[PDB]
């Protein structure tokens with residue numbers, strides 16, 4: 074279904090629901106390892122084959138040392154992912170527990186994350202980033218309107234793409250117990266957290282919009298923008314975690330370089346990076362921004378650009 | 388091979404237990420049960436390997452009833468630390484996973500043995516750098532064994548002779564100056580005292596600190612800036628008032644204001660006597 078789908082998005086959404094019905098209960102011995110898709114600060118992802126169904130899935134395994142009551146609640150809250158079906162949300166097959174590891178089985182995206190695509194592209198073109206912004210905005214809108222879910226972890230590594238041209242969000246906070254469990258267990262080296270949530274202030278999805286603009290700047294210049302590039306480094310066109318957080322809170326937000334990006338794109342990320350969470354643009358304001366309306370009209374062969382950037386075939 | 392180095396093919400590496408902040412632990416057999424931690428640093432430079440060997444020479448002579456026995460190390464097939472295998476669970480598993488119900492007299496004794504082992508480490512001029520309930524084991528349910536101490540040389544990847552130190556694993560036990568990573572060396576005896584203060588919090592509250600905050604980066608910033616500290620009101624009603632005062636002194640934001648373990652151990656021992 075009842076969403077603003079074009080006839081191709083609805084057919085792919087139907088095809089995913091069809092394959093999902095071939096998947097009964099997920100068990101560890103029903104899977105066969107193919108290859109590793111990558112590892113994060115608290116998880117590891119494998120390409121696997123679900124032998125009873127023949128489907129290829131991305132299986133994330135999270136090893137948490139928690140009390141079983143919390144673990145059982147985590148597996149419970151993850152079951153909401155069965156109802157998160159959108160062309161901009163990574164599909165979901167099942168979440169179960171075995172051998173001391175939480176398994177989250179999801180749709181395999183053969184284009185990887187935009188973090189991987191970024192290293193292979195050096196920089197991502199503005200016209201490509203326009204299609205990404207539309208997908209991230211509409212993905213965040215689906216999660217908040219249809220499920221009251223806030224993402225809380227918008228960043229290039231959690232925006233997934235495939236050779237069909239789909240751009241989907243993943244690793245969002247559907248389970249609040251899982252967020253707190255991994256907050257106690259691991260740490261990263263960077264951060265896309267908004268300055269107000271760093272100080273304990275909660276402004277709904279305004280923080281996710283900050284994270285998007287930060288990701289758009291990183292993908293546009295090909296470099297994590299905290300701290301800003303230093304002079305001659307920019308015309309080529311090791312901070313610890315606490316210093317990065319202190320910088321986000323106490324320094325002016327980053328910005329796109331002048332001249333090399335259109336004024337609409339520069340204004341779009343500036344409205345996304347206003348440190349004041351209330352003056353910061355919200356999801357409805359961004360969807361009618363000049364940069365989004367222009368990119369929504371542009372014809373961009375994203376699938377062709379992606380496979381070309383990665384080395385795949387069309 | 389070198390002193391206290393275990394040659395290739397001597398340890399029968401068994402089941403994989405889990406990964407921590409700087410290695411992956413396996414259950415092994417080598418003249419009995421052992422824990423083998425495959426270090427994350429797999430490609431050490433001669434400068435780092437020499438600094439690591441110098442630190443092994445220190446750690447292998449730290450022998451105490453409350454200190455997990457250091458049994459040696461390996462370089463082939465990969466860099467590894469071999470320690471005594473602990474039967475039972477760590478203090479973290481008892482408090483937060485199994486939820487073992489200890490009486491106050493036993494919780495004070497756990498803190499007393501931990502302060503005993505920490506006092507010995509600092510007497511030998513060794514900074515733990517990683518004290519946490521995960522590195523405190525209740526061996527055979529009675530004796531407290533502190534593990535994963537020192538090893539500063541392999542808790543970072545080396546660029547020749549200089550090393551960049553980054554936060555790894557949990558942060559709940561890190562002092563504000565350790566979080567910031569700004570002073571010449573953030574780790575000190577007083578930063579161990581802070582971590583011991585967090586362990587006291589776990590014992591006397593049954594909870595990890597900052598239970599109401601699920602945003603890790605908020606915790607890193609506010610603890611590092613001195614805006615956030617453990618809620619001492621979560622302390623259970625049967626906790627002796629001297630233990631709550633001692634806990635507050637260990638958790639002081641400025642490291643110059645934290646007591647040292649000779650005084651900490653003396654206070655816990657006095658409270659263990661002045662107790663029903």
Ligand SMILES: Nc1ncnc2c1ncn2[C@@H]1O[C@H](COP(=O)(O)OP(=O)(O)NP(=O)(O)O)[C@@H](O)[C@H]1O
Nearest residue numbers: 110111112113114115116118131180181182186230
């Ligand atoms: N559904 C998927 N299909 C294909 N690749 C995937 C999928 N999900 C995750 N990956 C890959 O697995 C990698 C590891 O994921 P993850 O465990 O979330 O760590 P991360 O997001 O990259 N970094 P971090 O979140 O800070 O720990 C990602 O970077 C992707 O390249």
Ligand SMILES: Nc1ncnc2c1ncn2[C@@H]1O[C@H](COP(=O)(O)OP(=O)(O)NP(=O)(O)O)[C@@H](O)[C@H]1O
Nearest residue numbers: 404405406407408409410412422471472473521535
């Ligand atoms: N000597 C040991 N005997 C038995 N189990 C151990 C021993 N050392 C570690 N373990 C277990 O091995 C797993 C991984 O430990 P470890 O890699 O040390 O991570 P951690 O202690 O949780 N954090 P850290 O020690 O700071 O890296 C945990 O389940 C520990 O309980």
Ligand SMILES: O=C(NOCCO)c1ccc2cncn2c1Nc1ccc(I)cc1F
Nearest residue numbers: 113114115116163177244245246247248251
């Ligand atoms: O995956 C996560 N963090 O990354 C791990 C660090 O490497 C993650 C983090 C928080 C969370 C809350 N509820 C689910 N959560 C996650 N999982 C997840 C969510 C949606 C999909 I679709 C697929 C997933 F795996």
Ligand SMILES: [Cl-]
Nearest residue numbers: 204238239375
């Ligand atoms: Cl598109």
Ligand SMILES: [Cl-]
Nearest residue numbers: 400401413425
């Ligand atoms: Cl192995």
Ligand SMILES: [Mg+2]
Nearest residue numbers: 113230231244
């Ligand atoms: Mg991720």
Ligand SMILES: [Mg+2]
Nearest residue numbers: 407521522535
């Ligand atoms: Mg340990």
